[PDB]
Ligand binder design. Sequence first.
Ligand SMILES: C[C@H](Nc1cc(-c2cnn(C)c2)cc(Nc2cnccn2)n1)c1ccc(F)cc1
Length: 300
Amino acid sequence: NLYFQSMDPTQFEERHLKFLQQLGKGNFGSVEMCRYDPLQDNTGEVVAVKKLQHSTEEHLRDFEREIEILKSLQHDNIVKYKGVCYSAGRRNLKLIMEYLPYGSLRDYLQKHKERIDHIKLLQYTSQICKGMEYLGTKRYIHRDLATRNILVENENRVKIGDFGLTKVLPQDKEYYKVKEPGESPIFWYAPESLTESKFSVASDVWSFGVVLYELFTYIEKSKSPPAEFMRMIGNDKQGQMIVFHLIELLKNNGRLPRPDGCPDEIYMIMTECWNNNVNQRPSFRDLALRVDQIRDNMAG
Ligand SMILES: C[C@H](Nc1cc(-c2cnn(C)c2)cc(Nc2cnccn2)n1)c1ccc(F)cc1
């Protein structure tokens, strides 16, 4: 009560944060490109600014937690936190980050195939794994690992880009049980997340297996995880029937197919991530080493 937590409300003053572009509407969030020009000279750093879409009390509280999570992370493959802008005369909150100029990995794969080959896909795979190793050291569970939530800095570097669903493990448990779910990315969820709302490092590994699938499908039309799972379950199914069939399919070893052109060894990594036995999934450290060994064992 007596002394409120630190903040730094002068680092990004709203009057000096200049709009450049709308980047996208995620899920209950909106991201802008802005320039922070404290000298009012038309210069300054370009930044990304994440804002809420629906400013309810619950969302503002969750957003503060998300900001604290991102501020606690410093790693080459995690988007860089810069600060907060307490706009509307210090009656609102906006998250300030570095700006990564190629956008989401999902869109980059679809729009920039001219500059993507398997070597790059393996580099991105390795980088995502390393970002996730780092999250695990903080006991953070991402819960939404998907190419749409990874950002592309340049042809040689990706970073995990959004943390809107990330949770902190309890001190005494190796999973977080989510007890008020919002919208759920079911086609990236491990079976125990679908059936028990349990999220862990191991369920992030399951989702990483879906990310790896995404990379090698080159986000081809009809090849996305939702499209392929719906083809397998039945395209006409709606509502909860989708979830019932997805669970039954996964529990009995139904899986996304090997993408066209995907090496057998890379599909093997996918299938090992997609183990119904949580403890038998590889760690992110195992995966980073294996991927980097594959890369390093190539000629040259
Ligand atoms: C919604 C936002 N969309 C978006 C689009 C583009 C873009 C499009 N086209 N081009 C040439 C660039 C750039 C950025 N950059 C950012 C965003 N947040 C922080 C740092 N950088 N974000 C986003 C996407 C994925 C993700 F994981 C986090 C945010």
